[model samples]
Target: MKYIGAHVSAAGGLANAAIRAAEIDATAFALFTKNQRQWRAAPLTTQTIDEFKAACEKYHYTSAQILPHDSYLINLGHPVTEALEKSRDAFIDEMQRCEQLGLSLLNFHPGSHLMQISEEDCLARIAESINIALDKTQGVTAVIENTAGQGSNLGFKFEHLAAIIDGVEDKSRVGVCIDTCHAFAAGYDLRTPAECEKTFADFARTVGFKYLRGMHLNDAKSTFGSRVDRHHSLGEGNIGHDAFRWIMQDDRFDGIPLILETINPDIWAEEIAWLKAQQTEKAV
Candidate 1:
């Protein structure tokens, strides 16, 4: 089955997020395990974890169907020693929360060099941080997301992600998440069928589809190679609907979360229904 959903609100708590996703009729969903902007939050209690898990069962979700996103503040590639440790420590905490909540996947940005460290060194540090984070936790697979090369973010290219994955000691516990808007803004064309084919061919050659674990399905508000990260609603931006059509039908992406990080929550249900219809209508 195709796992299509939106990043549901984690307001009130994790349990609230499950209900919100269910309200959207989402088969799969994404959420922040904590306040994404803050560096600290209350730890999940036993009751909290149990309630969230029960909600998942009620909504027909497997642990794999929900991807928890790391906070934006935890930059694993921070060059400064103090900041780096803070990131790593918080990353471990996040992983632990995922395990507690019975989640199998955690998706996050590859982190930025903050324009201080070399890209090569930054990538190595990111991988090193992942190694430590995994050593401290269990069960959850870390999924590194691609970016739009905005600022000093290191994951704008396939080589960057491949490099990070190569340095990971536990290959079984690591995977990749490609954001469609980020891919388009980073100069990978997906506007047409041929463009989609060639772009993903490059992805397969450099990163391999076997390592592809999940995806953020967003249309790009920015143009190709803009290096600016702005997400538009489906079919309303530069990336357009054709690429999404190609993605939904692609065999290699089956069973992974195709999450909408799109704008406008009001139309999210409509967007979900429209995209779901693509799967069956295309069979003709």
Candidate 2:
């Protein structure tokens, strides 16, 4: 089955996140292992990790179906030395936590250069940061998320993502997470069948299908190629139901985790049901 779910908040505790996912009838889910807004949080205790793992087992969710997001405060491509070092450390800590929770993937944004560093330098910094994090952590794969091409942010284009992957030494431990809203804003049109095929073709040509580990299934609030990062509901945005239907029908993304990052809590059940209904008969 194509693992599909939403990014649920772990406000009460990391273990409670699985209960929230089960309430929405999600087959898979994503969550922050710690507070995302801050860089200095305590490490995940053995008890917390065990509880989260037990909850996942009770809810019938596997480690492959769970994606832990990295801290929002991390910026590996920061121009300043101090900030970059801090971001690198935080990334390592986050990956270690994910390892303890037995999660297969940890998704994080490709940092921006902030107009101070060159794009090449930014990409190099990103690769170095990943290397550092991997050296520190045990088993989790670091998945670089595509962005909306906002400002100096990298990973807006497939070439940028490929460059980062190529720059990294140990590529087997790294992967890519494509965000639908970000892809639309970055100039890949998914509003039509022809456009969707063209976009996927471009992605395959640039970053190969092997590197695709997960997805952020979101609709766009802004127009195509607007370079804005606002996310809308499944059928309530510029990218309507047709695009999502195409994704559900495509076998290329089968078994990959598709995590919705949209904000409408009330319609989550309806959205999940709609997606499940669209799954092709051939799909598991």
Candidate 3:
């Protein structure tokens, strides 16, 4: 029952993203509700929201099948006061956009320390920022993404995720999205079936399965333990096909967005089909 798909483009219009997902035969998908690189974008018009919802309905995509990503410019745990406030404002806007679109999840990077704050302090700030956003918004979960631990960015460790979840006031409003490339780069092995089991077992022990709302399915282009975030297409990188196969068969992954952030956009349909095939073959 895995919901496998890619992060499709919202070019032309946001509704087009759902159509594109159907074109690729994706059961689940991810997209940016707005321009992810920009600090701001035009508000979601009522017509736009209606069209997007209609498209999703036509494609049989539910709020649970879609994971809207936040802007990359946002650092909810930014150390500076003014910068953190701005990030929080933009983050709340992102959540509101998700609410408007009828999407249930907003996936984003946890935060970066900028070498200006302690890792603990950064995690606390991220949790506090999330609390503020939850208080302001409704029905959207802040799906914190695990990082590659590149430079000063936090959330590379399962403990970091657990700590942030602990700091959050309303635990139901928070969840995690485990990017396979980031997890592998951050030193959690997923190169083999055994390694994959151990990695997820560790995640279950620390972050627990209840908070795993989604995942970014990718293979790593970087070396093991490199703490780099280079993503390669499935079965084309250091992480082989075994991990993905295991995921597709795992019941814990059922009913959540398993999104492919793979390098080749042209091959997303193939990847989604291949992943579904893996699930079916392994189920028998």
Candidate 4:
């Protein structure tokens, strides 16, 4: 079955995030184990980690269904040596947090080139950072998320992802996440049946479907190929409803976690139910 979920808030302790997902009847979910904006966060204590794991069990969410997002400050592609090293250390810390909480997946943006370095060199640096982090941790897969091409950010194309994955020493632990809004904003059309078909077919050709690990299901606030990163509610923007119906029905994504990072948390329950209905409608 397709795992339908949202990036729930982690306020009132990290365990509460899973409970919030369960309350909304979500089959999967994403959250930050600590503050996302700040660089320094108190390490996750053993008790809190146990609490999060127990919450997962209570809610019936498997390891694959819970994707923890990395910090906003982490830029593995930073050109400067000190900033790059800091980002690497923070990334490894996030991965270790996931391991302590019993989660198998950690989703993060590939990184920006800072416009100071060549994209080729930035991609190589990002790969080297991932390799170092993987060497430092065990049991958590590094899931690279596609971006909206805002600024000098990489991973906007399948080939960028391919290059980073090619550099990793252990290919088994690396994966990709396709964000619908990012794909549309990055210039891949998904507004119609034909466009969505061509878009994913291109992804398969360039990155291969085997590396695809999860997805973020959000409508785009910007126009197709606009390169803007704004997100709208489901069926309320350039992407519309049909593209989502297509995603729900696609067999290639049957077992992956599909999350909604759309604008308000108030509408998450409704969005979850709407996608669930689409999946049911397709099943029938």
Candidates 2 and 3 compared: the better one by lDDT is 3
Per-prediction TM-score, please? Answer: 0.98, 0.97, 0.98, 0.97
- Model 3, C-alpha of 224: deviation from truth (Å): 0.8
Where does candidate 2 stray beyond 4 Å? 280-284
Residue-level lDDT for 89 in candidate 2: 87
- Candidate 4: list runs displaced more than 4 Å: 281-284
Candidate 2: tens digits of C-alpha lDDT, residues 1-284: 78889999799999889999999999889999889999877777889888998999999889889888898789988899999999998898888888888887999998989999899899889989999898877788889999998877888998888888988888888989999999999999999888999999999999988999898989999889999999999989998888889988888877878899986978887888889988746634
lDDT of each: 0.92, 0.89, 0.93, 0.91
lDDT of 2: 0.89
Name the weakest run of 10 consecutive residues (lDDT summed) in model 2.
275-284
Write one digit per residue (lDDT tens) for candidate 1, span 1-284: 78989999998889888899889999999999999998878989999999999999999889878888999899999999999999999999999999999999999998999779899999999999999999989999999999999888889999999999999999999999999999999999999989999999999999999898899999999999999999999999998999988888778888898899998788888888887888885432
Residue 223 error, candidate 3, Å: 1.0
Q: Distance (Å) between predicted and true CA of 170, model 1?
A: 0.4
Q: Candidate 3: lDDT of 141? A: 98
Question: Going through the candidates in order, what is the number of backbone clashes in each?
Answer: 0, 0, 0, 0
- List model 3 lDDT by residue over 91-131, tens digit each: 99999999989988999999998999999999999999999
Model 4 poorest ten-residue lDDT run? 275-284
* Candidate closest to the true structure, highest lDDT: 3
